[PDB]
Amino acid sequence: QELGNANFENFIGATEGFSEIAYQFTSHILTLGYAVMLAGLLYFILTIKNVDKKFQMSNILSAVVMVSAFLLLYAQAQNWTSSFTFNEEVGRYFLDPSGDLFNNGYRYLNWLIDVPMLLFQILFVVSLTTSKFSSVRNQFWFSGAMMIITGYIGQFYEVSNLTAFLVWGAISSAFFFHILWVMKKVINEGKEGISPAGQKILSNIWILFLISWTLYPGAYLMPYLTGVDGFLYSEDGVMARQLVYTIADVSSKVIYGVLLGNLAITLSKNKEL
Amino acid sequence: QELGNANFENFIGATEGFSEIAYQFTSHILTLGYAVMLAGLLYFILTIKNVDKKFQMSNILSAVVMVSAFLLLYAQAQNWTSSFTFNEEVGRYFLDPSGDLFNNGYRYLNWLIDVPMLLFQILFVVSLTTSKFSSVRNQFWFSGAMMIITGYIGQFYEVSNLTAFLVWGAISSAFFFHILWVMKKVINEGKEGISPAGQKILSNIWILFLISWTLYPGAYLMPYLTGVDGFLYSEDGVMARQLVYTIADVSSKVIYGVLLGNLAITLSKNKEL
Amino acid sequence: QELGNANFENFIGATEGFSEIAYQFTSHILTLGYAVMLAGLLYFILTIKNVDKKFQMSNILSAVVMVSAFLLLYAQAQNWTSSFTFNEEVGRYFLDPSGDLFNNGYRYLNWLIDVPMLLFQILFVVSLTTSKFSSVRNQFWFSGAMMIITGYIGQFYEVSNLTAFLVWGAISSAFFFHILWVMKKVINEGKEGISPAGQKILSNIWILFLISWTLYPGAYLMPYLTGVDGFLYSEDGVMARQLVYTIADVSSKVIYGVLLGNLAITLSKNKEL
Amino acid sequence: QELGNANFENFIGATEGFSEIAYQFTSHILTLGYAVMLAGLLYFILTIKNVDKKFQMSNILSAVVMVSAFLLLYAQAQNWTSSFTFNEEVGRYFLDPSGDLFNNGYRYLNWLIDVPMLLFQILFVVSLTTSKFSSVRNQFWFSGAMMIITGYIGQFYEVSNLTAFLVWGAISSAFFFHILWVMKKVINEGKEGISPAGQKILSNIWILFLISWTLYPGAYLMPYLTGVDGFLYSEDGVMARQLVYTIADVSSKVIYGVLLGNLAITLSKNKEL
Amino acid sequence: QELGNANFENFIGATEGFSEIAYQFTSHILTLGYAVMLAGLLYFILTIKNVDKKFQMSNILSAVVMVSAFLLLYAQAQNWTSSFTFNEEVGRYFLDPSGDLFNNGYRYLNWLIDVPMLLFQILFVVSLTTSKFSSVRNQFWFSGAMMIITGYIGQFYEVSNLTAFLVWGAISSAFFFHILWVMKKVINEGKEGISPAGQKILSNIWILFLISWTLYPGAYLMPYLTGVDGFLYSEDGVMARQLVYTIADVSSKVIYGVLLGNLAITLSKNKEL
Ligand SMILES: CCCCCCCC/C=C\CCCCCCCC(=O)OC[C@H](O)CO
Ligand SMILES: *C/C=C(C)/C=C/C=C(C)/C=C/C1=C(C)CCCC1(C)C
Ligand SMILES: *C/C=C(C)/C=C/C=C(C)/C=C/C1=C(C)CCCC1(C)C
Ligand SMILES: *C/C=C(C)/C=C/C=C(C)/C=C/C1=C(C)CCCC1(C)C
Ligand SMILES: *C/C=C(C)/C=C/C=C(C)/C=C/C1=C(C)CCCC1(C)C
Ligand SMILES: *C/C=C(C)/C=C/C=C(C)/C=C/C1=C(C)CCCC1(C)C
Ligand SMILES: CCCCCCCCCCCCCCCCCCCC
Ligand SMILES: CCCCCCCCO[C@@H]1O[C@H](CO)[C@@H](O)[C@H](O)[C@H]1O
Ligand SMILES: CCCCCCCCO[C@@H]1O[C@H](CO)[C@@H](O)[C@H](O)[C@H]1O
Ligand SMILES: CCCCCCCCO[C@@H]1O[C@H](CO)[C@@H](O)[C@H](O)[C@H]1O
Ligand SMILES: CCCCCCCCO[C@@H]1O[C@H](CO)[C@@H](O)[C@H](O)[C@H]1O
Ligand SMILES: CCCCCCCCO[C@@H]1O[C@H](CO)[C@@H](O)[C@H](O)[C@H]1O
Ligand code: NA
Ligand code: NA
Ligand code: NA
Ligand code: NA
Ligand code: NA
Description:
The structure is a homopentamer.
Chain A (H helix, E strand, L loop, with lengths): L8 H7 L4 H27 L9 H28 E4 L4 E4 L9 H17 L11 H22 L7 H30 L4 H26 L13 H32 L7
Antiparallel strand pairs in A: 1-2
The site of one sodium ion has 3 residues of chain B, from strand 1.
């Protein structure tokens, strides 16, 4: 049938269908996703007063991000279950178009909150040295936006036009590297003039940041990481994508936020952990 | 097919249908919309105590507006997905009337909260000089209401009766200019007798106000901004409209609110920024 | 078609149908309704500490009322859209009985919260002189209940049995007048021994109370206020009814609550307006 | 139609159907139910600080109960409207089995929260004299559970097996009397050594407790209180049952909680009424 | 019918169907489940300040767990009612595949929150002696994850491949024993150097922990605990499973959390129990 500029899930769903395990796992992992986020929201609110006033914007922005991620991951969980329906005769879930086609683009546009705010929020915990606060912020936000928007365009074509897919993906990748560059700078300047404890945390944060954020382009490419007609262009690839998103999401948002909160505590004049 | 006094989305949806990208983007952008608003709600609540008591009503009214905008943008997101359904044979989303016709009027009536409160809330941060508080408030609220109501009538006719569309739109425009007039006055008087920092912010606020509020009549006209049978009388126009609303909404509500909060901090005896 | 003891909306919906504008407006105005209430809830909670402890129960009861009204107006918004479905052939929304018949009775029973609490809450702001607190409360609550219950019975018959409609309506009206009587007493005793500012507010409150509460029996009668086969026994009447309810609801609950809060501030030893 | 071990509502719904008034009222009264509970939740949270620390657990447990009752009464409201659908030809609502059969058992299992917590919470306000706190608590909780569970079994058979219905009901009744016994003791010991004001409240509480709790077995029996083929084995009985539950629910939970809160205030060293 | 790697509920549902009592009870018990959790959330938040600051993370993590469990138990309640639909002709609820197959796997992945956090949270109340905080945490979290993941795989095969079911189950059991081991250690070291009161509570906690956590593998095995074609491979088994989960859930999460909170109070320098 005619699907157009649609994500590859819909093509697997339309031709092969999804096994019980594939369908159910994808459902479960998204559910866990949004559950984590709402739990995180509660955590971050409830721990605001654990750090000095000046650090508390970090907690607030964590919370802001949790709201975004919850809403999206919740919405997307429902989108999954609507888009694919059990066929009794063969015993697999197939594309149910009355439910709309499944699209990962929901995530992308919601990153226009998540990404800016996640990058922003560190600047409230660490002190810069040679770099200017506003300058860093603006670079983060610009490159962030450009990264997302270009990627957002790309992913529409991941099946329909593999060239556009990769080119847009490439362009996106450029801006991603820019962000990585700037964040490294930030983390180094952050380490300057703070206890060894805080420096250890920032080291961890950087590793977390680097891995977790890298997963996202991983998910982008997921169906094609085993080349043409590969293992991953399958229900197995579908599962993998949503798993990776969920790991990325938990890492890049919740754990990131927790570490920052721990950093803020060390840097806090009253407070101890 | 008889549609009557219906928005142009329904006509595009009924004749041409929407591509994957068009349908999905519109869906995504509204989702982002309401996500932003609920995140904003949390922000504004959580930052109430960042400013002196006398300023805190600004935070509260921001919050009030966020609730309104969330509920509406959420409701409207659902309305979009209900009103247009995938047709397998051609691979486009077409008007599904069992879901009701799509209408932008939801926004308009909900502005009867948003507009009054947004205009009101500045009067709790800035001090007037030559203008009377009650006088400004009453002018805002009257012209606000008249603007919205006349526009609300107009938009029902954007397809069915182009004349009514434009005339009502014109009348609305009058009241809009009145508001612009009064807000300018407010901003100027606001700048009098406050730090240069606060004056810079109010300068920014005015630019934000002017652009963001102007987008709304832009969205009004969107289908016809490329004239008859133009580029924008199409799924491309539909997308554009909802994008512009979302940019307007985020600018005029969230960012506006944030700037005011920053102003309130500068004006605050305790606090610095 | 056999509808029985049903509200007149269902008869208009079943015979003539509703135009786009009629259906959409009714939908919009209810949406605005419940939006206002949830915004109000936030306001009243967030402003508790703006008045002296003894007054804060007024804020709490406002909040209680907002919860009720939100839930109801939300539920009723959904009931509207479920009860009437677009017919493609003629281009009007007709009764969809699979969605249940539309009934205004939802409002009425929910008044068993709203009315008692709204009458109650003033007694926490004003001081009585010659009247006993418990006595006033009991008169309010009794007459309130009797008003609502009798009206609730009436409205089931507004089409099926015009006599029952009017008789029950009459009986209700009696109890309504009793309430008006007692509230006037309260307002006068309230004015005794308080500043001219507070007296001005109570004057306004009384006018608000009188008009806003009177709208409700206005809505009761709405289909018949232009007599038989009148202008208002039509989709135009349907719109009018729900508009009037929404104006009444906002006036009698939110604005009422705001004014009381303003009164409480004047009467507050610390605080000024 | 084979219905089996189902509540009598489903039998009325399946044979006679429900009139507009019957269906709509049942819908309204459940809606009011859950509205009241959520309003109560807000109240009890918002008034925590109105009593001395030692009493505040009463407020918290009230709140706990409100959450339970809201969720259930909400869920049950939706169950009602799903289970019965308008038939156009005769103009009555009939059993719609695609919506599941209606069952009152939802209430019962949720009492496993409500009952224990309601009995518990008084023990935080009154001081016992003769009796041991833990001892009373354990008797309450055991007899509570046994009451509910036996009743829960009973009500499945209220149509299918009248004998089982009554026997289980009887057994339940035993445990109920035990609770009444213990609560009386508690209330008497509570009155010992406190002001006459507080003693008056506890007198009221006991009357409230006794009536409100007794309604519940009243609702159990409701269809059969006018014997076989009686007035109440009808849509009129259905209405009655849900009305009685709602009165019971509001009395036994909200009002009960309010009175306890008032008692706590009198007993409070700081505070006065 | 072809069901594949599906839970046994779906097989009972597809062949025998569920009686009124079976279907309704399963529905009720899940509803009670999620009700309990949301009530718990409120409790744990509202009692944060009953213990010394250092203990309050226990309250917060309890709360985190409640959010998770609520969302899941809620989602699963809805999944139950969607997956099984009344058949009029025979009067039983049968598998409705348009609702998706029922799967218990939702629980399992959500344990990836619950388990880590429940194990973690004790380490904020007790002081270790010979064991290292980080060491215990890491063992808990690793073995926890491995337990869940292996079990999660197992349960997909509980019908389709009894061998895989048991093997994976066995592997899981290994990791479970490891956790039991570590928790015992923790409890003993916890008891060292604290009051007799605190020691009593930890004794209770251990018993609670041991029983409640053991129920979960009980539920795993439930359909087969009466061997082949046993009593429990039936609607009776289905009921039993969900009952056991609910008991487990309330015990292992809510009561566990309460006891820890009580412990924290005894250990609290300010406060008394
Ligand atoms: C058919 C039944 C009709 C139902 C509608 C009837 C109205 C009842 C409304 C609220 C009751 C709330 C319970 C409050 C009871 C305690 C009131 C109280 O204690 O009085 C205030 C006190 O004097 C100040 O400190
Ligand atoms: C909480 C969400 C986060 C941190 C999202 C991060 C997203 C990215 C780092 C996306 C990166 C991409 C590329 C660099 C290539 C493909 C397109 C993107 C946008 C997925
Ligand atoms: C948060 C929502 C806001 C700030 C809405 C503002 C709306 C306007 C400024 C609307 C203006 C209009 C015109 C001036 C012409 C066309 C009709 C309107 C109402 C869209
Ligand atoms: C917030 C809701 C309020 C204030 C509701 C007030 C309702 C009334 C004043 C109803 C009055 C009625 C009559 C006096 C005649 C017809 C029957 C009623 C109940 C609508
Ligand atoms: C908030 C809910 C409450 C207070 C529920 C109370 C329930 C009862 C007192 C039930 C009593 C019953 C009998 C004594 C006989 C029939 C079976 C029961 C459980 C309905
Ligand atoms: C709040 C949820 C909790 C405490 C869940 C605990 C889950 C377990 C202890 C699961 C144990 C299992 C086995 C040891 C064997 C079968 C597979 C599992 C995962 C059910
Ligand atoms: C500072 C905190 C350090 C935490 C370390 C704890 C690590 C626990 C993470 C568990 C990851 C388990 C990976 C399982 C691999 C999948 C194998 C499944 C068998 C088929
Ligand atoms: C850097 C990673 C990008 C690798 C691109 C792999 C190219 C895959 O190629 C595509 O594989 C699909 C899956 O079977 C086929 O259906 C398509 O016809 C084919 O174009
Ligand atoms: C200020 C901007 C208003 C300009 C009005 C443009 C006139 C549009 O003209 C309209 O275009 C529609 C779509 O192309 C056609 O379907 C209509 O028949 C036509 O009247
Ligand atoms: C206080 C105002 C009450 C006025 C009562 C007027 C009764 C109107 O009369 C009614 O009008 C309906 C609508 O046209 C008709 O359908 C009814 O058959 C007719 O009885
Ligand atoms: C304590 C009060 C218990 C009285 C129970 C006796 C009434 C049982 O009467 C029942 O009435 C039903 C409908 O009316 C009939 O369908 C049953 O056949 C009949 O047993
Ligand atoms: C306690 C853990 C081991 C239990 C293994 C019991 C073996 C169950 O055996 C299974 O029972 C099903 C239900 O009757 C049958 O339908 C299957 O054919 C059979 O494989
Ligand atoms: Na599905
Ligand atoms: Na759709
Ligand atoms: Na509709
Ligand atoms: Na129905
Ligand atoms: Na069902």
